[PDB]
Amino acid sequence: AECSVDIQGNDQMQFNTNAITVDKSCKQFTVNLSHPGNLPKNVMGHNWVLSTAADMQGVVTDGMASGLDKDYLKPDDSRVIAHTKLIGSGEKDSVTFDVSKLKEGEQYMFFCAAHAAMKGTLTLK
Numbered sequence: 253a254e255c256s257v258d259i260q261g262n263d264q265m266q267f268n269t270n271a272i273t274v275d276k277s278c279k280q281f282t283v284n285l286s287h288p289g290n291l292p293k294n295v296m297g298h299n300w301v302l303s304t305a306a307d308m309q310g311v312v313t314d315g316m317a318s319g320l321d322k323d324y325l326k327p328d329d330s331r332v333i334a335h336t337k338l339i340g341s342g343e344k345d346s347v348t349f350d351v352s353k354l355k356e357g358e359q360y361m362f363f364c365a366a367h368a369a370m371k372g373t374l375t376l377k
């Protein structure tokens with residue numbers, strides 16, 4: 253089984269995939285985020301945030317209210333399963349999480365908290 257994924261967020265405000273699969277045998281899973289391009293984090297920074305699909309809008313709303321000062325996430329938001337730091341071009345960050353925090357029948361989504369239009373699904377498979 254493959255228990256990690258490499259994902260890119262670019263200067264054009266896009267991730268390079270809209271779907272991540274976590275093999276059901278994985279006990280931990282690592283997301284390796286990078287930022288091709290040349291725009292720095294104070295212009296086009298990206299992170300990677302994981303919640304259930306049902307919780308995404310709520311996380312975004314409360315994140316918006318929390319602002320730039322908090323990378324647009326409510327600190328300690330229990331709905332946020334895992335998240336990376338905000339990165340600019342040429343920078344990278346990885347986050348690892350316990351797959352026990354995921355459930356087989358539930359739908360998850362990942363997104364950038366700075367640019368909530370940048371999103372995709374994450375599924376146990």
Ligand SMILES: [Cu+]
Pocket residue numbers: 261265297298299364365366367370
């Ligand atoms: Cu972003």
